[PDB]
Amino acid sequence: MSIGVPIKVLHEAEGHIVTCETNTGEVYRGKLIEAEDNMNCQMSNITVTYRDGRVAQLEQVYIRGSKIRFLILPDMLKNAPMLK
Amino acid sequence: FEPLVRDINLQDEDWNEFNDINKIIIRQPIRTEYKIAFPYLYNNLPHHVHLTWYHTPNVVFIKTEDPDLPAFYFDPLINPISHREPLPDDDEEFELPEFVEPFLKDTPLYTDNTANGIALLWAPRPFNLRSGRTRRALDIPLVKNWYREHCPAGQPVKVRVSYQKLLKYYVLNALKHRPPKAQKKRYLFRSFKATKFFQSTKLDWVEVGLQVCRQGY
Amino acid sequence: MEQTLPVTVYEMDFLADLMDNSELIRNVTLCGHLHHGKTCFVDCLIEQTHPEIRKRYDQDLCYTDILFTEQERGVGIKSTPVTVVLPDTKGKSYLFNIMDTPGHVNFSDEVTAGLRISDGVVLFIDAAEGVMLNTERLIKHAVQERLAVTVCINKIDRLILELKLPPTDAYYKLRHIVDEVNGLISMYSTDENLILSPLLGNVCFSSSQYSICFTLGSFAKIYADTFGDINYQEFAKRLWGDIYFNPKTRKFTKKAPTSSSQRSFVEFILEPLYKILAQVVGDVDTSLPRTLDELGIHLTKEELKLNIRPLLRLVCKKFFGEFTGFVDMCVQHIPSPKVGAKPKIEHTYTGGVDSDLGEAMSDCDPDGPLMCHTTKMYSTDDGVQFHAFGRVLSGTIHAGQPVKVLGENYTLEDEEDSQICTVGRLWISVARYHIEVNRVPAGNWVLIEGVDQPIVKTATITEPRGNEEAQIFRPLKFNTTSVIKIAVEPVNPSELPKMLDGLRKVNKSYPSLTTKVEESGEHVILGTGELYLDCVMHDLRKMYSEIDIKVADPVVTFCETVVETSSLKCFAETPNKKNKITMIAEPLEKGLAEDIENEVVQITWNRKKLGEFFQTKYDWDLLAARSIWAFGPDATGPNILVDDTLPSEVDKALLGSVKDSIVQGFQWGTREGPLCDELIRNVKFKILDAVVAQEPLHRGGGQIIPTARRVVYSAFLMATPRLMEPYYFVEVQAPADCVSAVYTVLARRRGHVTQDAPIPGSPLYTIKAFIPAIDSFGFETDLRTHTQGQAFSLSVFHHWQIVPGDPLDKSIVIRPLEPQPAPHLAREFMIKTRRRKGLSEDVSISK
Amino acid sequence: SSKMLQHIDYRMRCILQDGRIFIGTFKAFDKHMNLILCDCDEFRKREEKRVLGLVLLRGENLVSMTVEGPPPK
Amino acid sequence: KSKELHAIKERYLKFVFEWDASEDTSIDYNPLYKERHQVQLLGRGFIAGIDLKQ
Amino acid sequence: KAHPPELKKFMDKKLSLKLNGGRHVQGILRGFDPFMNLVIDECVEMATSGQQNNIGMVVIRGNSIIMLEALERV
Ligand SMILES: Nc1nc2c(ncn2[C@@H]2O[C@H](COP(=O)(O)OP(=O)(O)OP(=O)(O)O)[C@@H](O)[C@H]2O)c(=O)[nH]1
């Protein structure tokens, strides 16, 4: 009644591998450490692909939640009890 | 009781290199209670040994004495507690919102029927209940929990023998108990009332006793 | 998968996918004193993760005391593993591997078996009883095994319903329990980072009977869910200690506003709980629906008709919900297998963390070499085949995968103990039903089938054709020593092989069971106490071997020692009459034997550290301090061998040729002992002259070893030999009135009372006393019968003490069936033990 | 809001602000209209399909959605 | 002491309306099994039947 | 209800902060708010021209913050 299911699913994703696509077209794939009720994601070991396609490595990343377009979650979360 | 089954006897086992009484250190005799408490250690050939219920945590219940004391009160029977932390600073800006108080703040801690309501937790059955099914008058033994206690020291020998004899039949009943057989409900008195030979009324018990006496005569 | 299983709140696919992520797994063992609530917790959690499996209204479904004797005795006997997926306060889910351990002091071996494969400990403490004997013993054992320690103060309802303490005094009782635990931890550990306090989330408060379990954070979250605008994490930091709430300023201060102001814990946590319980148990008809309305709980009509205890359980379950505080505790303060792998390898792996295989194991990488350690063996109800149980520290085990099983004697040079076996099936162990799986990655607990044949107690399962330099994990180091000894013999001698097979099976089951065959063809079982041996024999007669077995009288194991220095310097020569050794025996300094056994000193140290230790600790000169050759029958035996041979008198280079043999002779001699074939304890052996034959064809091998053993025996026999009893430490809880009765019971069995003291906040007393182990059979029954069941005692082995008499004195005449006076107890203990062993009737004191 | 609990589990294509098309199984939604789509594929324009999986998109970039396939078995 | 040793040695080597007293048990030698400590119940619980004032 | 974003692990930490209009900013964090508006000590501009320009005490609106990276190890 207060906090939506997708935010709960994102909470479940902590500790797995996640790929993050911000409005600047930058793709961040790495281990999601923490997440809040907002999409503020603290995520680590980033393989980052820019718009041109350049790939870099960046060990610590904190993304503002307002600036996420979409988040791709691991498929085992499809079996989360919260997705039933 | 009497021997359950005829078997070997304490005078029937010959001396062996096992059970030789010259190899045995005696400090305290192996009483029968020791053999009941650990039936598989202090005993040879244990059969039909029902393992006894081990210790139950001691119920430290402080029975109240005066109803003019608080229900939650440090009774003198309770041994005193001898007096003697990353807490945040007072200046830390944490404030509890205006409309936040402990959950039950208007509800009094204890009512006038709180001490009595706790004492009902440890009452013997059926006084620990608040609902149940009625029993027949003859199915309620009022002294069954009297002779299940220890034999009272100092009473004459007849009283103690009576205690033990009552316990014997109690144990036999509990042991020889058989499941009630499945059947089809057939009631004699309903059958009697169905026929035209019987009729119903409502009489004093003494009058019916006199009628039954005369009828039997 | 594909197994019919009880329906869960989660789904087993999620459980299987959690096992791969080693950061969401928590390997936890539940331990505590006897009957301190460790088992409801498991069902108190199984129920919350199993909608259909509920506890009976009038009877608690133990669900982990799955055994027969466990169900009748109501005493935890064997560890039962439980693997459940538990949600967190924040809604996240973790996979929990929980080890439910028995709380009886006799079954500590099961606790050590659980501790080996666990990364953290949840210590359960009764709120009314407090810190009892086994709580201290398990704290010591857990902080010694380098495990994260957390505390769950169970049975807090006893403070409310039984003792009826005022909320402030309940707070004092809880703070006192926490302080006692903190003091014990600081006593047994040097580093400070194991401070236990509910402010840090280390301590939880619970009442498993009534489905109550909360930390400070979880209760603050209840507040936040009711009143949205509060931040529960910062709220929780003000809910303990001498911090008071000021309702006028709406701020928490360290000073009480005016007077009659209650601490934050009382005002916000203890008082609401007191009021809930009081309303339910006193005003269920009058004013319960209104308070239930206030808390937001709505109970249906047939639900309000329940008896008081089920109604209280239901109300508290509605109010609190799931056990999120416990999961918060175990997630924040118990390392994941990935993080906790390094201390585990550092402590329990023989190769050390520095080893190449040690590194791959410390990574806890599930694509590395297989390294599975098994510590428990569970027998199927048929009693024929066993299933090994242990955690996969590295690699990944598969069903049907051939494996190489290493025993306890397997070394990198003696590779004969290893044996190839084929894994049959793998079960994710839950308390009652096994969930069969196809593979188990690193960091998880697995029940293995097919590797039970070549293992006795523990094993290390690796991969064949790889992992050539794979050593083993250290065998379990137990808390106690098996002392109580009984002999077994089949009624019909024809079926002896059946009893031998049953003995092997029980040796597999009980981790600390020691079954040996004495020289006289007598089969002997060593146990910790009466209940331990009772259940061992119950299993032996009924489960594994279906034959009838006779049981001898219980007896203890003795030890042999000296009390002065040897009168005449003994000597013994080889049959070649060329090599001659001269030795003397003297008693060790007070408190040195305990230092040796407890690994305070090790012969693996360089001679410099050994010498400096002995110099600074026991007034040894450098010559003798560096002169140590061996350390008793084992590497840590309570005896010492010292060479006093002068460099001028004997050439030290030639003495080095026979050092390696004199050490073995002394070790074997101390292993056997001359008096009654018992261990020698607290004896210092000094070599005075070792004449060595120059020709190596005369010395070495089977010529010098027996000479060394004989000279050890003879040197021991000159200095007055004495026997040693094992002494038990008994803690008794009893009311004030029965304390005198406890004294009376103890006085009859050579008991010596050390201290009696009240239990703070409880109407009972604790009597701590010392009793000889042999004068202890039936002591528990005597105490519980003389006191009409109101006094209960747990006994545990403490130390070794000298029997009053002198074993070598033929003047004493002993009758066959009478208790002996103390002045000559040692003579009886010596000759009767000799007769039991089958030796001669008396020793032959000579040179 | 029953107008979208009716659409759950249905294979849904959602139009993005940048013109991106996301076809997948509608699982969950919230007040901010963040969508949970499982076994989701993205269609971009040159025709090409990139299989992604479980996508949690923020409500910011979501524009328009439409049922494309019946719920699977 | 003497009964102690005797017990050790033993172990290791008509319409009768009233019960015969020979059937009695609890004729024991150990003083702990004769003079049993009586439960006091914190001085607040009492045994059923017997007069309270006693 | 506006919970403060978790940047305490990034406290006192040298950080690189990219912007809306392809801008990028470097410095060490000194505090935040529930709107994550971010204060930077020893701030360095280093615009896309390639030249690093240092300012010092600066405070940024969180609405233009794209992504926060801790250059130094946290
Ligand atoms: N008053 C009270 N009694 C409880 C509570 N939890 C359990 N008990 C009871 O206390 C006893 C403890 O039994 P268990 O919980 O099975 O014991 P354990 O802690 O597993 O310990 P072991 O017997 O060594 O296995 C039982 O009678 C329980 O029903 C509680 O919260 N309050």
Numbering used by the authors:
A (entry chain k): 1 to 84
B (entry chain A): 279 to 362, 369 to 501
C (entry chain C): 105 to 951
D (entry chain h): 6 to 50, 61 to 88
E (entry chain D): 243 to 255, 271 to 311
F (entry chain n): 3 to 76
Sentences from the paper on this structure:
The 20S U5 small nuclear ribonucleoprotein particle (snRNP) is a 17-subunit RNA–protein complex and a precursor of the U4/U6.U5 tri-snRNP, the major building block of the precatalytic spliceosome. The 39-subunit U4/U6.U5 tri-snRNP is the largest preassembled building block of the spliceosome, which joins the splicing pathway at the precatalytic (pre-B) stage and delivers two components of the RNA catalytic core, the U5 and U6 snRNAs, in their inactive configurations requiring further remodeling. Here we report a high-resolution cryogenic electron microscopy structure of the 20S U5 snRNP, shedding light on the mutually exclusive interfaces utilized during tri-snRNP assembly and the role of the CD2BP2 in facilitating this process.
We determined a cryogenic electron microscopy (cryo-EM) structure of the CD2BP2-bound 20S U5 snRNP complex at the 3.1 Å resolution. In all reconstructions, PRP8 provides the scaffold for the entire complex and interacts with multiple other subunits. PRP6 is present in the sample, but only its N-terminal helices are visible, and the tetratricopeptide (TPR) repeat remains disordered. We observed two well-defined densities located near PRP8RT/En and PRP8Nterm domains, which were assigned to CD2BP2 domains D1 (62-130) and D2 (150-233), respectively. A hook-shaped extension of the CD2BP2D1 bridges the PRP8RT/En and PRP8Nterm domains and probably stabilizes their relative orientation, which differs from the one observed in the tri-snRNP.
